[PDB]
Design a protein around this nucleic acid. Sequence first.
RNA 1: ACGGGGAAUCAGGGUUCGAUUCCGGAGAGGGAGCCUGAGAAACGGCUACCACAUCCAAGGAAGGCAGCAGGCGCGCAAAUU
RNA 2: UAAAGUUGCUGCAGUUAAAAAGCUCGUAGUUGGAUCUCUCUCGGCCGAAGCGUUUACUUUGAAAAAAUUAGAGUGUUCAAAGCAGGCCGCCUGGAUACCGCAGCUAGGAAUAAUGGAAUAGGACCGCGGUUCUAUUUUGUUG
RNA 3: GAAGACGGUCGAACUUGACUAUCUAGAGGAAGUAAAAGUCGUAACAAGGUUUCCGUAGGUGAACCUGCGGAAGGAUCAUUA
Lengths: 151, 262, 141, 129, 149
Amino acid sequence: ADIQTERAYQKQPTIFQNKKRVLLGETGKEKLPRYYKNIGLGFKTPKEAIEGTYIDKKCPFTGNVSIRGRILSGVVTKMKMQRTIVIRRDYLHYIRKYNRFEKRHKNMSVHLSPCFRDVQIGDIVTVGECRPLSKTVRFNVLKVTKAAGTK
Amino acid sequence: ARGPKKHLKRVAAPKHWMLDKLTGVFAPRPSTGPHKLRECLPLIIFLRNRLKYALTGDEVKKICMQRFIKIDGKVRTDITYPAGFMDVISIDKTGENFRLIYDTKGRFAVHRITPEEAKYKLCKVRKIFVGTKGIPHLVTHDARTIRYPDPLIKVNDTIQIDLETGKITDFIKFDTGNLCMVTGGANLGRIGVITNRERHPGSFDVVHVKDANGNSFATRLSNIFVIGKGNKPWISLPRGKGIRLTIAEERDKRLAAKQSSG
Amino acid sequence: GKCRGLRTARKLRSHRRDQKWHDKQYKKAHLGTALKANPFGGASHAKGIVLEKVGVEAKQPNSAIRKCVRVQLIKNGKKITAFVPNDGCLNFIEENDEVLVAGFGRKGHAVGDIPGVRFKVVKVANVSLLALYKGKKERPR
Amino acid sequence: VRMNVLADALKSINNAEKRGKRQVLIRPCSKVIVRFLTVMMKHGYIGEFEIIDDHRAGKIVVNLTGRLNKCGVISPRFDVQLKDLEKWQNNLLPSRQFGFIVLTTSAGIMDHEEARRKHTGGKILGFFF
Amino acid sequence: GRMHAPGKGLSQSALPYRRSVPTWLKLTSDDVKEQIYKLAKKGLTPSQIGVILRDSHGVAQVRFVTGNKILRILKSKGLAPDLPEDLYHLIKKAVAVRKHLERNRKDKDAKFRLILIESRIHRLARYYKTKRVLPPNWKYESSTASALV
RNA sequence: ACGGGGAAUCAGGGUUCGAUUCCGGAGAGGGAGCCUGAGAAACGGCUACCACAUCCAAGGAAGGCAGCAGGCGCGCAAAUU
RNA sequence: UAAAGUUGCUGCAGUUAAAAAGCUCGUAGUUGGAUCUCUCUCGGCCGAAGCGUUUACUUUGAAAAAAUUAGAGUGUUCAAAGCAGGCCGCCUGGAUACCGCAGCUAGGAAUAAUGGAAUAGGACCGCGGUUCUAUUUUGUUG
RNA sequence: GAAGACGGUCGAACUUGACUAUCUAGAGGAAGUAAAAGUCGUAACAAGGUUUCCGUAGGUGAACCUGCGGAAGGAUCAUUA
């Protein structure tokens, strides 16, 4: 489970990992301090974020992003990108002339932190608005709700 | 496009200036200052349109350049200077002082005050921050930075400052039961007692206010300006005491006044 | 029958939009083919040069010779046959002069017993045919 | 297949009233059917009715007073606001003196006059006059 | 009417109003369950179990005596077929008509009926996959149909 | 096809329009690149090329009215240098 | 544009006037039967704290430029308009409504929906058994 | 610190290659459309004088004719133990 899989060293920029230790008081890797924050609006930090080891600069809990703006929801449809998933948001648009609605949808590419493991296609995810993380990504997954049709 | 605009079309001006459309193409574009463009009152509007002391903008310029107008105790020669909520306008030559207070219809009333009450004003604080070697600071709705404020003064409270020295004299906490004024929106100009505040994290808070006659309304927290402790005001209220009358009672009072007076 | 569902707005809208193309007026006014085929090009009037005078025979049920002029429009160079309305008014028109020509009143359709004519002369030599007819004005020298 | 059992119930009542019958058998029964019939009966249009309990889905035998001209369903059940209610009454009712639009509101199933009394809009179920 | 035929038939059972165990039934619930287990061990489907219990021993409805349906009882003890009985019979019919069509390629009515049967199979399988009775990747294929029968 | 506020009948519903004085955007003959400046990829700023076009003593120099007026042209179609 | 219920959502028509595919499966779409009425802190009716299963409604409450439109007042000499107008220096007005949809907030839960226990892998209880201890103590810190 | 090609960048232009849709020129060929008893010559409408028509194939001096299957919109709602 190597973390350093890139050409540059991966580490949380806040945590200093070169502090001097004591020889007689150290036997094995003692601890690596973990940087994590609690995002607002009542969202609880997942356990895997606090006690994990992954490095994600776009993670809402262990990264540099701040959640602000719209809190949305959607269902996972594709998981074929690194730390990024595609969710679909279905809604009904009212046509005034016919007094009726039509089904419409929009796909949003949202960032999924490694603190959410075993997220499946069809799960309901709560996303929060953040700064542009890529060309199309502007939302971060904050909570994953398992689908009713799951194990 | 290409840098800031310097004109204001007369029909794009704030509606509470009560400007008419046939006078000209332009309205006096208020200069930058302690108050926002859409919720201020340019000195020319007050001196010409309200007080009728001048007939044209040239006469307003003459009055202002004679150093007769004092806003918050300072002589202001700018005829488009933005004067706003709780600002004190003192004209020493004619010996009258005005305080810019919204009337119940959302417009700046010509509210005359005694010279004793013209020596201070109420300022809602916008932020408190610590800077420059642990020195607390305080920013008001009037864009005044007051150093070394009382540690009990937090955001959304209103302080009372003496105009001559520019120092905090007293303050009122933001709490239920305190009298307040609405400075924006549909209920702008109304005066009542704060009854309940609903907090919406990540969004705007809602404050519920009740009048003296029991009418209850609500507005966003940014639009609340607490006037006094409890139900008594620290400043003098306009001819209407912040009560908004429905059009039926307005018409009834107008008809009764027409009947009684001949 | 037609669909009646709370989520049938798209179906109703698309069906109406597709069925509107089976309306003659709608297809004529929105396809744009009738616009390019219009000699006036969407204009109410046009100015042309009288190429010759022609008399077109009336349609079968009644007999007459309709005094028309073959004109060439200035804007696009198209050739046009225009009816000269009143009597003697063909004498007010000379070959190779400017005429203002309007429609015949049926929006590109032939009017009356005149076959294949949908334009009429309004002014000749910058003076109206009615002023010349009523004697209010004379032909410029 | 059979959708909108209320439409079937109202069509059966209308057809039996046109034929001049004194009783109509409605099946299957439903809660909405019973509420619509109760609203009808409070206004004197339909009279007493009995719910036959078979162990799957009830049937209703409805006595028929000859007072009913037409009972109809509105499909789909459009959401109606209190400001759009007058347009619906002009579209559906013979006059402003008689005739009722039955709405389903969070305050229950009732006619348009009660819905305006309780200051509630809802979803249009049907009408009767 | 029928889903794949123009017929509109009214033939079906008419359950009586009384949900009680009949007076003639001296068989308690546990004896009924034991007979259900024995009949299932003999290799009978729930429909056949119900038919035999109604015909020979005399049980108006197993649900009114034991409180559970036959398939639920079989699943509770654990004797139920891996795939549902109606789907199994549809697959069996499809296999039969496919085997017939191999030596009867000119039978163009058999091809049409096979298409209808496979449509029924696909609809039923989709329903069962919706309710997790079948694995989400359960697929019916002609080359593998006889492997399920 | 600049967008919107909005405009043309009132049964209810709609159908058309919105270049046009207010708001937002874009452009200054067409592209492109810049200096200054808080703010411009500015054109009543500059530098080129492309298309037009002015004075010349033929070496050169100077241009940008979709600003107000006015011309020509185009046109069915629109005002006072 | 209305007339055009000749584009029909309201609200058309399809045997013979123009018209239902030769027929049947079928995915998306649309529609879909009955059925459910010491949890919580200053004083024995109060802010906080709510996963009530998210919703769709419905009704509120904020925020939605002015001008235009609707509309209140006001004898422009009447009116279109305008935002203004008398009384041997004082009184006033310069309102209000609407502002679709989509966002934000708040009752009751009728009515598309969504069904939380079915190999039980389902509240509450006694065990803290190596651990963080009102960010380990509570005579002069062990 | 005042001119000038060069690890370069943005980049108008400029010739050469394909030969691009809104646009036009000729004797043409096929066809459509407007009332015209246009030199022996009638397909349909009555059983229209071979009942009409549909699909599909041939053939024709023209409507048309013929074969096969079909329809009644037929000239039969009917034909007898």
